[PDB]
């Protein structure tokens, strides 16, 4: 493990790799109480133990807390100059898209007030949509909140298009489908899981609550932590409960009648699962409060693998695109740790 300190007065809230855009996949953003900081990951000589070190590049000041953070495919590099596009959520309950050239915010769009969410925003994600001619036609941001609303915010050539959709319960996560921006997934706090075609009722709703194996009772309150697609065509869906209970469904052949596989993490997962970018069957989950991280294999290859235990709480974490490195933001730092097995 190598450890890289965040500035002394910087409290991290969120950590994400720029896996969404290959030109910028070595860019790391930390949303904190005064903005979003960008770091670069480089192969040093090091020892080929952790043959990867972190270089802090710069800090984008915003003046208020950043709670969720997503890079877009529009990110680019030039010589040098970084052209960034970031979706995030701020203390004023607004959802924003910030477009920068390095630390300087050259452009900013803000969706808030009554036109925005009418309660706390719980999650956000972003994807670039191109026309048939293949110019940038739209950038699309999806967000979910405690106002029982899902918001699709499309920024198009002739300007913004806003749409709201009602939910049976607070939205706790949302993510567009890989290799198919026409589809996306929305998570409700109550265990409902929506598959949605925004170009169009919405196509499908699964639910983890009634499926709990109950060989070991998952408890009275098993609030849904997370749902994410897996695979590079978005061939699968993985859902994780706060309790640690997880379930996986695949989407291809024949007729289907239950979720394909199911299990339970050793610990609660407040932050939910972070699926491996290269190995579908694998995902990571943290015991954020004691600072341990379990690695789970869906086809039970795993047998309780806990590669990571810190002596401190974990605020957030995410896989580097290479699949062997992990970046983890803790309350005062970010660690890059390399698991030798995944190399």
């Amino acid at each position: 493990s190598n450890q890289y300190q965040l500035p002394l007065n910087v409290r991290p809230y969120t950590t994400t790799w720029c896996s969404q855009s290959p030109s910028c996949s070595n860019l790391l953003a930390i949303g904190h109480d005064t903005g979003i900081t960008i770091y670069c990951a480089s192969e040093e000589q090091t020892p080929g133990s952790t043959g990867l070190t972190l270089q802090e590049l710069f800090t984008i000041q915003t003046g208020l807390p950043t709670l969720h953070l997503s890079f877009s495919s529009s990110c680019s590099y030039s010589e040098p100059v970084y052209s960034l596009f970031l979706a995030c959520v701020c203390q004023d309950n607004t959802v924003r898209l910030i477009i920068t050239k390095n630390e300087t915010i050259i452009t900013q769009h803000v969706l808030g007030g009554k036109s925005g969410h009418h309660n706390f925003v719980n999650d956000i994600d972003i994807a670039d949509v191109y026309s048939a001619d293949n110019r940038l036609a739209e950038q699309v941001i999806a967000s979910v909140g405690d106002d029982c609303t899902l918001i699709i915010w499309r920024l198009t050539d002739e300007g913004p298009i806003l749409a709201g959709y009602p939910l049976s319960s607070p939205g706790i996560s949302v993510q567009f489908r890989p290799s198919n921006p026409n589809q996306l997934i929305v998570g409700e706090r109550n265990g409902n899981i929506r598959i949605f075609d925004w170009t169009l009722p919405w196509l499908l709703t699964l639910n983890t609550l009634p499926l709990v194996n109950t060989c070991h009772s998952s408890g009275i309150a098993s609030s849904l932590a997370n749902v994410r697609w897996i695979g590079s065509d978005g061939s699968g869906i993985l859902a994780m409960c706060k309790s640690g209970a997880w379930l996986r469904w695949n989407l291809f052949g024949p007729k289907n009648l239950l979720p394909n596989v199911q299990g339970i993490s050793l610990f609660p997962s407040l932050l939910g699962a972070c699926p491996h970018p290269r190995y579908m069957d694998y995902f990571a989950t943290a015991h954020s409060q004691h600072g341990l991280i379990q690695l789970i294999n869906t086809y039970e290859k795993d047998s309780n693998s806990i590669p990571i235990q810190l002596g401190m709480p974990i605020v957030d974490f995410c896989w580097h695109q290479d699949g062997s490195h992990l970046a983890i933001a803790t309350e005062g730092s970010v660690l890059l740790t390399r698991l030798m097995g995944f190399t």
Binding site: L167, E188, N190, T205, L206, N207, T208, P210
Partner: peptide, 8 residues
Amino acid sequence: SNDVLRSI
């Protein structure tokens, strides 16, 4: 399933 119904 329950998750679906809850989300609805």
